[PDB]
């Protein structure tokens, strides 16, 4: 209960930039976010956030041209909400995002939605 | 239940015993406590109100007081925000009640109110 909420109430702060000290630029497209929370739930950003993890100065300014802005978006309401919304468009794309990310649940989600489905050589 | 939220408070719990990411400082009876003004915001009407006004700015970490309070009672006030689970009793359950209330803490405040429920008060 606590918990839901405690989610619920960070992801309406970073849809309102409240205490956004981390910038996302993915084509061009800018996502606002909290430090602490990428930190905890990507390992990509446990590693670029941290040795400027307690340097409370202006906020970290982070860049992707290795995916979308629809993918990441998706990636990013996947950390906020614990929903990755799938299908068949973007379960690659989201798969190949999260192992970038090192987003570990992420791509088993992948592996198994992908399951679900059929893909062979032509 | 929600693993991704249950780990994810975890995480934050250990970050700010680290000093990780902790912009808010807490003196409460000479100790202190370092916890993430985001957090506390999301936790507190209290903070969420003096917090507000500074909600865009990233400086320097902002630094609350409280003598309202006991550093104990704070302690399982602010282990609560971490963990969600507040440990009640006789000793602590009243001024853990007005600590909710003075930050504003509705659910805690709920929650000492049902404890109350489960013991008995009467005139001496």
Known sequence: ????????????????????DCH???????????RNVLFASS???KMLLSQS??????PI???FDVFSAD?????????????LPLSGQNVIEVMSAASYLQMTD?????KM?????????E
């Open 71 to 83: 993918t990441f978006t998706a990636i990013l309401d996947f950390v906020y909400s614990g929903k």
């Open 61 to 63: 300014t982070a860049t």
């Open 106 to 110: 992420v791509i088993g989600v992948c």
């Open 1 to 20: 209960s606590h918990h839901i909420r405690l989610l619920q109430q960070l992801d309406e702060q970073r849809q309102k930039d409240l205490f956004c």
């Open 24 to 34: 996302i630029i993915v084509e061009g497209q800018m996502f606002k976010a909290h």
């Open 53 to 58: 993890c307690r340097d409370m100065g202006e």
């Open 113 to 121: 939605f992908i399951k679900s489905s059929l893909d062979i050589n």
């Open 43 to 45: 390992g990509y950003f």
